[PDB]
Nucleic acid binder design. Sequence first.
DNA 1: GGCTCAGGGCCACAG
DNA 2: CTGTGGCCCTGAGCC
Length: 102
Amino acid sequence: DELCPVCGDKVSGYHYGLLTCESCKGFFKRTVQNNKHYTCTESQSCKIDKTQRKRCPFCRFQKCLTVGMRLEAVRADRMRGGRNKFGPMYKRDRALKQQKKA
DNA sequence: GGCTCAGGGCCACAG
DNA sequence: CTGTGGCCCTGAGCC
Ligand SMILES: [Zn+2]
Ligand SMILES: [Zn+2]
């Protein structure tokens, strides 16, 4: 029921410090791990919408970092255990954000 | 020690 | 062929 603060897709859960989808997760890795770097000709921060998120990769990347996606969470190495020192924040934020009881 | 919780890899389908 | 977006498996984490 929640949408990504960047691309706007349905979130699959907590990824990189935010409620994000596999599109964010996958693209974020594809960008950061492969050391990709882009640049927008004008307006480095365009309107990141469902269509315009495809035309501006740089703006989408900037959007990710801006909305709060951890760049340090990108284990470009290989180790699937990409839980760094900010690992606790996931369950912490989740417990505060939801705080729903059992 | 075990169940959870989230991330990285490779995939399959869409441009 | 290239790429978005995803499901899957492994791994850090916490209970
Ligand atoms: Zn997303
Ligand atoms: Zn742009």
